[PDB]
Amino acid sequence: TVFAFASMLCLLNSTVNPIIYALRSKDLRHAFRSMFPSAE
């Protein structure tokens, strides 16, 4: 689904990435705001 990539990129990238997350660690950045349970 490269379209999902181009989309997430156009979105998650253009709207927040060329600042700090860039794209590395982004994987955790949003997942953190969308996944991290903080159990341990």
UniProtKB/Swiss-Prot annotation:
What upregulates or represses it?
Answer: Up-regulated by endocannabinoid anandamide.
Lipid attachment residues per UniProt (S-palmitoyl cysteine): A39
Q: Which residues form a coiled coil?
A: none
Does the entry annotate any disulfide bonds, and if so which pairs?
A: none
Q: Where in the cell is it found?
A: Cell membrane; Membrane raft; Mitochondrion outer membrane; Cell projection, Axon
Q: In which tissues is it expressed?
A: Widely expressed, with highest levels in fetal and adult brain. Expression levels of isoform 2 and isoform 3 are much lower than those of isoform 1.
Name the residues that span the membrane: 2-23
Function, in words: G-protein coupled receptor for endogenous cannabinoids (eCBs), including N-arachidonoylethanolamide (also called anandamide or AEA) and 2-arachidonoylglycerol (2-AG), as well as phytocannabinoids, such as delta(9)-tetrahydrocannabinol (THC). Mediates many cannabinoid-induced effects, acting, among others, on food intake, memory loss, gastrointestinal motility, catalepsy, ambulatory activity, anxiety, chronic pain. Signaling typically involves reduction in cyclic AMP.
From the record heading the sequence, give the disease linked to this protein: Obesity: A condition characterized by an increase of body weight beyond the limitation of skeletal and physical requirements, as the result of excessive accumulation of body fat.
Quaternary structure, per UniProt, is: Interacts (via C-terminus) with CNRIP1; this interaction attenuates constitutive, but not agonist-dependent, inhibition of voltage-gated Ca(2+) channels in neurons. Associates with G protein alpha subunits, including G(i) alpha-1/GNAI1, G(i) alpha-3/GNAI3 and G(o)-alpha/GNAO1; palmitoylation is important for interaction with GNAI3 and GNAO1.
Q: What else is known?
A: High-fat diet also increases the hepatic levels of CNR1 ligand anandamide, but not that of 2-arachidonoylglycerol.
Which family is this protein grouped under? Answer: Belongs to the G-protein coupled receptor 1 family.
Spell out the protein name for this chain. Cannabinoid receptor 1
User: What gene is it encoded by?
Assistant: CNR1
